[PDB]
Amino acid sequence: QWEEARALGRAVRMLQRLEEQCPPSLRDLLPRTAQLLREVAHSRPGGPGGSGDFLLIYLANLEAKSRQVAALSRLRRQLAKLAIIFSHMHAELHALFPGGKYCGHMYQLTKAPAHTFWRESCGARCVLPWAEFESLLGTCHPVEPGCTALALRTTIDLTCSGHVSIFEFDVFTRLFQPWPTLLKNWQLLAVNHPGYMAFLTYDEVQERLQACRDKPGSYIFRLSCTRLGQWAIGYVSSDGSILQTIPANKPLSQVLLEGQKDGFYLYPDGKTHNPDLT
Ligand SMILES: [Ca+2]
Numbered sequence: 001q002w003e004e005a006r007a008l009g010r011a012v013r014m015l016q017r018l019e020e021q022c023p024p025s026l027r028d029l030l031p032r033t034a035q036l037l038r039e040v041a042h043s044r045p046g047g048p049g050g051s052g053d054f055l056l057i058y059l060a061n062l063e064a065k066s067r068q069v070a071a072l073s074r075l076r077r078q079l080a081k082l083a084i085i086f087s088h089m090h091a092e093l094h095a096l097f098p099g100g101k102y103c104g105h106m107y108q109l110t111k112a113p114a115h116t117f118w119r120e121s122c123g124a125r126c127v128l129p130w131a132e133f134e135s136l137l138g139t140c141h142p143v144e145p146g147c148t149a150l151a152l153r154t155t156i157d158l159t160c161s162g163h164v165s166i167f168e169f170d171v172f173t174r175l176f177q178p179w180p181t182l183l184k185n186w187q188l189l190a191v192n193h194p195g196y197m198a199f200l201t202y203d204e205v206q207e208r209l210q211a212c213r214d215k216p217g218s219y220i221f222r223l224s225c226t227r228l229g230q231w232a233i234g235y236v237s238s239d240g241s242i243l244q245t246i247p248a249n250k251p252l253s254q255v256l257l258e259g260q261k262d263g264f265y266l267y268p269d270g271k272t273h274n275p276d277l278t
Helices: 002-020 026-043 051-070 075-096 112-122 130-138 147-156 166-175 179-191 202-212 252-261
Strands: 127-129 163-165 196-199 218-223 232-236 242-245
Touching (some): 002 051, 196 202, 202 232, 232 252
């Protein structure tokens, strides 16, 4: 209430400080996040998992990750990773508090069945702890206990807070549509497919595909910080030049099958074996 206002205040001063101490770049993200937080502070509880609980979890997590950055190739390997995480935290804040104003209670998921699943399972809540989320999901899509779950957390919990927000669920269900085979799609595209690069930049995809330039049909697919919930495919055309496609709001496996049948997507990461997706 006033606890929230105070924690909002601490957060912004903490970000300004972290900025002094310094794509996706922390120099661009830090002040953007600080500005959004002042707008949030200015515009300002809900039930459990409402705007208040969300802010509390968000601010603790922002704090924890800020300490990790402050206490800092393999140094650059870990700064890059923290930088992606801050990008993710800025996007989540932006989606649930556009212009500082909480919209979590009426936020609309892009895929209709994902929408229905979330609102029927969580009601007005915009955020849920991993354990509850995993359990609720499991009533609809069997999640195997053990290591599968760890890989699934990494895919879904973008902000690495141990909580899944409605935004992260939206991102995940867009990427791995259609709903009826949700986890199966995730398993085929993100666990078992050598074409999958997770988060890359355009430049990194270019760099990666250089060694495949004399092999047209070589391709890869990646996620993008500033375009959460969509794919990009990098591929070698017959000319040997690296092009990028952004697939429509439609299943990735369909785009890849159609591109396999056209001769564009044949060699994931240069490799000869192209997984059967039929
Ligand atoms: Ca999270």
